[PDB]
Design a protein around this ligand. Structure first.
Ligand SMILES: CCCCCCCCCCCC[N+](C)(C)[O-]
Ligand SMILES: [Cl-]
Ligand SMILES: [Mg+2]
Lengths: 211, 212, 131
């Protein structure tokens, strides 16, 4: 069957930049290629069909080209709302195939997180387990290190992170880290701290509490 | 106007069956092509099946040949996908989509429907407060299956500053996630903040007043 | 009318049927084309070639049934303008399938697969047109 080999699998460019995304078809599919954009947890929308026809209502910054079996989506003045994943498809032969996707991230200016920490509620502790949550709010770039410290003891293996998808207006990320303990262990100790490392902080920040 | 409304999704045991449904408005199934395309959580788009009633023409992906059947009731302007012998690899958001006919680009997709294939069983979630210039507060939504939950704040009245996080699969086998919002510090004590968790797979609706 | 003489008499004996047998040929060549699995680029070119040629022919035959009869008298009978329009559509599809690709993005047309099937059907309707 037909493969659509698409690259890069992800890229990061600034507002105003011209990005190029490529899709090679394993054999001629003529001009039956289409490009779709999909924002996170949404249905794809169509941008281009027949390789290079702009679909009605789509901003003309988006264009398509054919060269033999090489297809190119060009976004020629990247806007911050263009954060999405872009999929090429061929629909000439069957089955219909898609490329693995390009995940476009918008490069913006450095911004340090704001850091919050939250102790476990009474509610939860009255059930045998204690979750402590460290929040990093609205920052860029996405690289960030969170370490948990219990009474200066560096905590490994017992926390989990989740990052939001990149904002579509101001291009930032938020992140949570959850330390999870048994009521028993949470009672054994006093000082609960998360240290956050990031490029917009000139040295790591700690938020802590006691109890 | 063109709309495609999928329903029929949800949780189902391996070996089991489901029947997705797609309701069309703004064009006619009977002369158009309807497709079902799916997306395994975290992955790409896999085409699954198509029908162009006008030609008595349907078609299937190999991963699905034999187990799934696509069809249209041209008088309800609706399409269906019958899914039998579900396996775990079939877990996905299943999108209904249309094109003018079978050799024309797909030009519109529904928001899709979540099919989860698993032996494991619906558990609704526990909900805890993350109690608190600018101040941060939130809800920890914890120990639930399957995805997904639906947090809003003050019955969706509050949206600005709100971040709900991707659920995280705990090693237990259940999900938890948090939802946080940032608000002015002056408003704690005067303004009331509630988070409306909602887990349709369990008919669970929980509301936590969070406060200092 | 100065040339309409020598042409309109050349379009008989034996172009009457050769042209028709050439239509049968065309459909046959297509059925073989569609029946042979997995033919190479080179075999494909070869069969695409024969399809185009046979189409170029039908195209000339029609810049003669117009040069020879004259724009207005052929064109009066719109019945023949169907069979003429038909020729032209298929020639356009074939020229693109066999040679002018991969310039077709430039046409901005979509529905390429059904265009093709159409033009294949049209070749048959050509005999159907013939009483
Ligand atoms: C309006 C002009 C468009 C007519 C084009 C007809 C479709 C051309 C199909 C080309 C298929 C070529 N190939 C090598 C993939 O088989
Ligand atoms: Cl634009
Ligand atoms: Mg956001």
């Amino acid at each position: 069957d037909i493969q659509m080999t698409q690259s890069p699998s992800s890229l990061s460019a600034s507002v105003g930049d011209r990005v190029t995304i490529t899709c090679r078809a394993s054999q001629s599919v003529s001009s039956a290629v289409a490009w779709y954009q999909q924002k996170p947890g949404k249905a794809p929308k169509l941008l281009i069909y027949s390789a290079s026809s702009l679909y009605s209502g789509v901003p003309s910054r988006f264009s398509g080209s054919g060269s033999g079996t090489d297809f190119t989506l060009t976004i020629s003045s990247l806007q911050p709302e263009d954060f999405a994943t872009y999929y090429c498809q061929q629909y000439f032969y069957w089955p219909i195939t898609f490329g693995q996707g390009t995940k476009v991230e918008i490069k913006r200016t450095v911004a340090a997180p704001s850091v919050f920490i939250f102790p476990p509620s009474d509610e939860q502790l009255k059930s045998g387990t204690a979750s402590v949550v460290c929040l990093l709010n609205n920052f860029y770039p996405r690289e960030a290190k969170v370490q948990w410290k219990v009474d200066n003891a560096l905590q490994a293996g017992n926390s989990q992170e989740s990052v939001t998808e990149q904002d579509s207006k101001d291009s930032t990320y938020s992140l949570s880290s959850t330390l999870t303990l048994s009521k028993a262990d949470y009672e054994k100790h006093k000082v609960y701290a998360c240290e956050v490392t990031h490029q917009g902080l000139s040295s790591p920040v700690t938020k802590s509490f006691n109890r | 106007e063109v709309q495609l409304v999928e329903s029929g999704g949800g949780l189902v045991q391996p070996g089991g069956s489901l029947r997705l449904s797609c309701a069309a408005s703004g064009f006619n199934v009977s002369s158009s092509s309807i497709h079902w395309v799916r997306q395994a959580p975290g992955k790409g788009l896999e085409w699954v099946a198509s029908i162009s009633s006008y030609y008595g023409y349907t078609s299937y992906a190999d991963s699905v040949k034999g187990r799934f059947t696509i069809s249209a009731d041209t008088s309800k302007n609706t399409a269906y996908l019958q899914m039998n012998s579900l396996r775990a690899e079939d877990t996905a958001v299943y999108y209904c989509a249309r094109s003018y006919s079978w050799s024309y680009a797909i030009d519109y997709w529904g928001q899709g429907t979540l099919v989860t294939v698993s032996s494991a069983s619906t558990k609704g979630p526990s909900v805890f407060p993350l109690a608190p210039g600018t101040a941060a507060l939130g809800c920890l939504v914890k120990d639930y299956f399957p995805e997904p939950v639906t947090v809003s704040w003050n019955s969706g009245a509050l949206t600005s500053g709100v971040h709900t996080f991707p659920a995280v699969l705990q090693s237990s086998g259940l999900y938890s996630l948090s939802s946080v919002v940032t608000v002015p510090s002056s408003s704690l004590g005067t303004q009331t903040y509630i988070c409306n968790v909602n887990h349709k797979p369990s008919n669970t609706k929980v509301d936590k007043k969070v406060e200092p | 009318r100065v040339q309409f003489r020598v042409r309109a008499v050349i379009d008989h004996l034996g172009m009457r049927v050769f042209g028709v047998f050439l239509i049968f040929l065309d459909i046959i060549l297509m059925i073989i084309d569609l029946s042979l699995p997995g033919k190479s680029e080179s075999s494909q070119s070869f069969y695409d070639g024969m399809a185009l040629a046979l189409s170029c022919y039908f195209m000339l035959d029609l810049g003669l049934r117009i040069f020879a009869y004259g724009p207005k008298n052929f064109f009066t009978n719109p019945w023949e303008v169907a069979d003429g329009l038909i020729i032209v559509v298929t020639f356009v599809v074939t020229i693109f399938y066999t040679v002018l690709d991969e310039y077709v993005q430039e046409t901005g047309a979509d529905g390429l697969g059904e265009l093709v099937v159409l033009a294949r059907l049209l070749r048959v309707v050509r005999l159907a047109r013939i009483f």
